[PDB]
Write a protein that binds this DNA or RNA. Structure first.
Lengths: 53, 48, 47
DNA sequence: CTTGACAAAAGTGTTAAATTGTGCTATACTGGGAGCCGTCACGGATGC
DNA sequence: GCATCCGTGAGTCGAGGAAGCACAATTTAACACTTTTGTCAAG
């Protein structure tokens, strides 16, 4: 987040647009309390059998 | 003439013989009601 | 019995929604006024 | 409040069939196969 | 900045519903014997 904020001061609009999009995802993970590695599954949940009868 | 009063209709009426068909859509096959009945497996909502 | 129908409860389709969302590894939780979890499964799914 | 007698009825121990799971075949074989096809619109996405 | 591609979206009810084989390991069907109710007289 600190590097993205520093790059947010770049004069180029495309650089600021790219940094903002990355920072928005970073801010979402920081505020929510989720961990980025949770996006990779180590255990797959299995639906209850009555919902897949 | 009007069969209820016996008086004529105030204007002459186009009367003739026309060929009319009874179509396959009948209210006997379409009327349906339901208070309770079968329910779906997963959603448990009524069937259709 | 000649009585007025009772107050309804949570639909079973919403329960199907939660479990199908959980099968996608998404933690969907129903909260109360104080942000505390509320069990809509009547204790039947808690270990 | 019982007290013995009996008669099924469920429980237990062997016992064999019947079913189910697994290993094994020795001439030489060495890169798949159906896709084939009449919309049009938007937003977005790196790419350049 | 600009084609090009990828993705997503496009009304509601109804009514239609191609090996075999041997051998081992495991489960299951039958009995045979107890142990336990269930049901009687006796009170």
């Amino acid at each position: 987040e600190k590097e993205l904020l520093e790059e947010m001061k770049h004069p180029s609009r495309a650089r600021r647009a790219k940094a903002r999009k990355r920072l928005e995802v970073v801010r979402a993970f920081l505020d929510s309390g989720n961990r980025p590695e949770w996006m990779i599954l180590e255990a797959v949940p299995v639906l209850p059998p009555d919902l897949r009868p | 003439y009007d069969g209820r009063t016996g008086e004529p209709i105030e204007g002459p009426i186009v009367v003739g013989q026309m060929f009319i068909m009874k179509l396959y859509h009948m209210v006997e096959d379409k009327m349906h009601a339901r208070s309770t009945g079968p329910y779906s497996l997963i959603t448990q909502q009524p069937l259709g | 019995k000649g009585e007025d129908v009772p107050e309804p409860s949570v639909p079973e389709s919403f329960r199907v929604l939660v479990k199908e969302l959980q099968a996608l590894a998404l933690d969907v939780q129903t909260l109360d006024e104080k942000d505390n979890p509320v069990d809509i499964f009547e204790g039947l799914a808690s270990k």
